[PDB]
Design a protein around this motif. Structure first.
Motif, PDB file in Angstrom:
ATOM      1  N   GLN A  40       0.829  -1.204   0.000  1.00  0.00           N
ATOM      2  CA  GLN A  40       0.000   0.000   0.000  1.00  0.00           C
ATOM      3  C   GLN A  40       0.870   1.264   0.000  1.00  0.00           C
ATOM      4  O   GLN A  40       0.685   2.170   0.810  1.00  0.00           O
ATOM      5  CB  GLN A  40      -1.038  -0.021   1.139  1.00  0.00           C
ATOM      6  CG  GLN A  40      -2.111  -1.107   0.966  1.00  0.00           C
ATOM      7  CD  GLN A  40      -1.572  -2.523   1.158  1.00  0.00           C
ATOM      8  OE1 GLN A  40      -1.322  -2.947   2.284  1.00  0.00           O
ATOM      9  NE2 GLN A  40      -1.387  -3.262   0.062  1.00  0.00           N
ATOM     10  N   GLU A  42       3.693   3.522  -3.152  1.00  0.00           N
ATOM     11  CA  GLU A  42       4.047   3.720  -4.555  1.00  0.00           C
ATOM     12  C   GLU A  42       5.560   3.904  -4.665  1.00  0.00           C
ATOM     13  O   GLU A  42       6.199   4.329  -3.708  1.00  0.00           O
ATOM     14  CB  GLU A  42       3.301   4.931  -5.129  1.00  0.00           C
ATOM     15  CG  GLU A  42       1.813   4.618  -5.333  1.00  0.00           C
ATOM     16  CD  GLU A  42       1.018   5.844  -5.775  1.00  0.00           C
ATOM     17  OE1 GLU A  42       1.571   6.638  -6.567  1.00  0.00           O
ATOM     18  OE2 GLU A  42      -0.139   5.964  -5.315  1.00  0.00           O
ATOM     19  N   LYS A  52       4.882   7.071   0.344  1.00  0.00           N
ATOM     20  CA  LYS A  52       3.446   7.211   0.574  1.00  0.00           C
ATOM     21  C   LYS A  52       2.704   7.291  -0.769  1.00  0.00           C
ATOM     22  O   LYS A  52       3.210   7.927  -1.692  1.00  0.00           O
ATOM     23  CB  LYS A  52       3.172   8.459   1.430  1.00  0.00           C
ATOM     24  CG  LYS A  52       3.884   8.397   2.792  1.00  0.00           C
ATOM     25  CD  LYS A  52       3.611   9.635   3.660  1.00  0.00           C
ATOM     26  CE  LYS A  52       2.508   9.420   4.705  1.00  0.00           C
ATOM     27  NZ  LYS A  52       1.192   9.178   4.094  1.00  0.00           N
ATOM     28  N   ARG A  54      -0.704   8.394  -2.084  1.00  0.00           N
ATOM     29  CA  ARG A  54      -1.178   9.754  -2.287  1.00  0.00           C
ATOM     30  C   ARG A  54      -1.919  10.149  -1.013  1.00  0.00           C
ATOM     31  O   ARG A  54      -3.137  10.331  -1.011  1.00  0.00           O
ATOM     32  CB  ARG A  54      -2.028   9.862  -3.568  1.00  0.00           C
ATOM     33  CG  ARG A  54      -2.008  11.261  -4.210  1.00  0.00           C
ATOM     34  CD  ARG A  54      -2.767  12.363  -3.451  1.00  0.00           C
ATOM     35  NE  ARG A  54      -2.099  12.789  -2.213  1.00  0.00           N
ATOM     36  CZ  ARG A  54      -0.969  13.510  -2.125  1.00  0.00           C
ATOM     37  NH1 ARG A  54      -0.362  13.976  -3.226  1.00  0.00           N
ATOM     38  NH2 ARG A  54      -0.439  13.765  -0.922  1.00  0.00           N
ATOM     39  N   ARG A  55      -1.157  10.276   0.078  1.00  0.00           N
ATOM     40  CA  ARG A  55      -1.639  10.698   1.380  1.00  0.00           C
ATOM     41  C   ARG A  55      -0.637  11.714   1.923  1.00  0.00           C
ATOM     42  O   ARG A  55      -0.928  12.923   1.794  1.00  0.00           O
ATOM     43  CB  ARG A  55      -1.783   9.483   2.313  1.00  0.00           C
ATOM     44  CG  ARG A  55      -2.899   8.494   1.936  1.00  0.00           C
ATOM     45  CD  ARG A  55      -4.279   8.858   2.500  1.00  0.00           C
ATOM     46  NE  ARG A  55      -4.859  10.049   1.868  1.00  0.00           N
ATOM     47  CZ  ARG A  55      -4.955  11.290   2.375  1.00  0.00           C
ATOM     48  NH1 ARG A  55      -4.472  11.590   3.590  1.00  0.00           N
ATOM     49  NH2 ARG A  55      -5.538  12.246   1.642  1.00  0.00           N
TER      50      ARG A  55
END
Length: 55
Positions: A40, A42, A52, A54-55
């Motif tokens: 989970q 990238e 991370k 897209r957080r």
């Protein structure tokens, strides 16, 4: 190839997280976005480490 396969690595020097095909000299990162996604995350394609999503 046979009788070796001279190539020019894509990354600079510290290419620990890379592999290169010893026929065509095509480069790939040892750590793929598939692995990051399974965790989970990238892939940061520059260093090829998982960051991370897209957080």
């Amino acid at each position: 190839a046979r009788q070796e396969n001279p190539c020019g690595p894509c990354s600079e020097r510290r290419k620990h997280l890379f592999v290169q095909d010893p026929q065509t000299c095509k480069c790939s990162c040892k750590n793929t976005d598939s692995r990051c996604k399974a965790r989970q995350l990238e892939l940061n394609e520059r260093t090829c480490r998982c960051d991370k999503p897209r957080r």
